[PDB]
Structure formats: C-alpha cells, structure tokens
C-alpha cells in the first residue's frame, strides 16, 4: 500500500506556522509532502519574515499530481496570492472534480471562494476572515476550531494548526496513525 501524498501551496505572505505545522505533522504521519512554491522554486518570504525554500515550483509539482490532499495555508497576503492565481484555480478545480480532499486554514479558505470551490459547504476561517469568506452567502459559517464537510476541510488560525494537521492525517491515514503521531507532540489535548 503506497503512501498518501500532500501538496502544500506556499505563496509570499503565507503564515509560516500554518505552513510548517501541517508539513511537519503530515511527514510524521508518513505522508509524502511536497511544499510547492506558487511563484517558482525560489525562497518564499512568509508573513512574519521566516524564509522557506520550497521543494519544487507549483508548475513542476502539478505535473507530479494528483495528490490525496491539497493544503492551503493562511496569512492574509498569502491567501490573496493564492486567490489571484490561475494555477491554483486549476489545481483546486481538478482536485474537486476527482473528489479529492482540500484543506485550508485561517484566511486560506477565502481562496476557495475566489475559485468557486465547494460552494454549499459548512466552513470556518479565522474570525477576521469571516466577512470575506461569507460574501454572497455561498457557504455556511462554523465556529468549530476544525470543520470538515465531506472533502472540504477548514480551520481557524495558528492556534488550531495542530488540530487542522491531525485532522488531515486522520482523513488520509486513519485515527490510529493520527493518535500515534499526536502523542510525541506533547499537545495539551
């Protein structure tokens, strides 16, 4: 049984904690994760100036798809860049069409709105991104720290990143693996 694969799209202004926590946790779960740079293979300056080097450009990562999950980190500027990307729209449309999981956190879910992805789904976002996400009433809002409506998985912010990541792990590799990965993290609960 092959390992599941995850695509994490990294754009300038992305919230680095929301990027690194899921990448790290998913790799601990044995998931093959590809950190793809939206703008290319060059280093990406995140929201709080942490600079991360992507594994590959989104263009090249796309050719190695499809993935079991496409992950969209948050960060206002990062989400805006994801929202304006035609490449991202294509990847999300494809993932949605093949009934693959899409996970977005914080401001990240607003990219789903921009690309008309999963309308009708119950979703959550960072409290400050709620109004943007709800423009038009295409989704139903939730205040749950992690919300999962079928193949659309959303979360609220840096502080829900571990919960978000573990939810992705459970969705791809099961409850047992998620629990095994969780223990050594020393989370409160």
From Swiss-Prot:
Entry-annotated residues carrying N6-acetyllysine: 148
Cofactor binding annotation: Deglycase activity does not require glutathione as a cofactor, however, glycated glutathione constitutes a PARK7 substrate.
Residue numbers with lipid attached (S-palmitoyl cysteine): 46, 53, 106
Upregulating conditions: By hydrogen peroxide and UV irradiation. In pancreatic islets, expression increases under hyperglycemic conditions. Expression is also induced by sulforaphane, an isothiocyanate obtained from cruciferous vegetables.
One Pfam assignment: DJ-1_PfpI
Effect annotated for changing residue 53 to S: No effect on mitochondrial translocation neither on deglycase activity
Site (Cleavage): 149-150
Positions where Cysteine sulfinic acid (-SO2H) occurs in the chain: 106
Post-translational modification: Sumoylated on Lys-130 by PIAS2 or PIAS4; which is enhanced after ultraviolet irradiation and essential for cell-growth promoting activity and transforming activity. Cys-106 is easily oxidized to sulfinic acid.
Protein topology in the membrane: Lipid-anchor
Record annotation: effect of changing residue 18 to A: Strongly decreases enzymatic activity. Almost abolishes detoxification activity on methylglyocal-adducted CoA
This protein's record includes keyword Protein biosynthesis: no
EC numbers for this chain: 3.1.2.-, 3.5.1.-, 3.5.1.124
Active site residues according to the UniProt entry: 106 (nucleophile), 126
Tissue expression remark: Highly expressed in pancreas, kidney, skeletal muscle, liver, testis and heart. Detected at slightly lower levels in placenta and brain (at protein level). Detected in astrocytes, Sertoli cells, spermatogonia, spermatids and spermatozoa. Expressed by pancreatic islets at higher levels than surrounding exocrine tissues.
Enzyme kind, highest EC tier: hydrolase
InterPro entries assigned to the protein according to its UniProt record, in alphabetical order: Class_I_gatase-like, DJ-1, DJ-1/PfpI, Prot/Nucl_acid_deglycase
Subunit structure: Homodimer. Binds EFCAB6/DJBP and PIAS2. Part of a ternary complex containing PARK7, EFCAB6/DJBP and AR. Interacts (via N-terminus) with OTUD7B. Interacts with BBS1, HIPK1, CLCF1 and MTERF. Forms a complex with PINK1 and PRKN. Interacts (via C-terminus) with NCF1; the interaction is enhanced by LPS and modulates NCF1 phosphorylation and membrane translocation. Interacts with NENF.
Protein task: Multifunctional protein with controversial molecular function which plays an important role in cell protection against oxidative stress and cell death acting as oxidative stress sensor and redox-sensitive chaperone and protease. It is involved in neuroprotective mechanisms like the stabilization of NFE2L2 and PINK1 proteins, male fertility as a positive regulator of androgen signaling pathway as well as cell growth and transformation through, for instance, the modulation of NF-kappa-B signaling pathway.
Name used for this protein in its record: Parkinson disease protein 7
Organism name: Homo sapiens
Gene from which the chain derives: PARK7
């Amino acid at each position: 049984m092959a390992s599941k694969r995850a695509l994490v799209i990294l754009a300038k202004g992305a919230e680095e904690m929301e990027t690194v926590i899921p990448v790290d946790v998913m790799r601990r779960a044995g998931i093959k994760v590809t950190v793809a740079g939206l703008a290319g293979k060059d280093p990406v300056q995140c929201s709080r100036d942490v600079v991360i080097c992507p594994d590959a450009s989104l263009e090249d990562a796309k050719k190695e798809g499809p993935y079991d999950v496409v992950v969209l980190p948050g960060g206002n500027l990062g989400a805006q860049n994801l929202s304006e990307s035609a490449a991202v729209k294509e990847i999300l449309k494809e993932q949605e069409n093949r009934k693959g999981l899409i996970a977005a956190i914080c401001a990240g879910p607003t990219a789903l709105l921009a690309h008309e992805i999963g309308f009708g789904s119950k979703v959550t976002t960072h409290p400050l991104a709620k109004d943007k996400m709800m423009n038009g009433g295409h989704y139903t809002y939730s205040e749950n720290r992690v919300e999962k409506d079928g193949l659309i998985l959303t979360s609220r912010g840096p502080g829900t990143s571990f919960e978000f990541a573990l939810a992705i792990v459970e969705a791809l590799n099961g409850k047992e693996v998620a629990a095994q990965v969780k223990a050594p993290l020393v989370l409160k609960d």
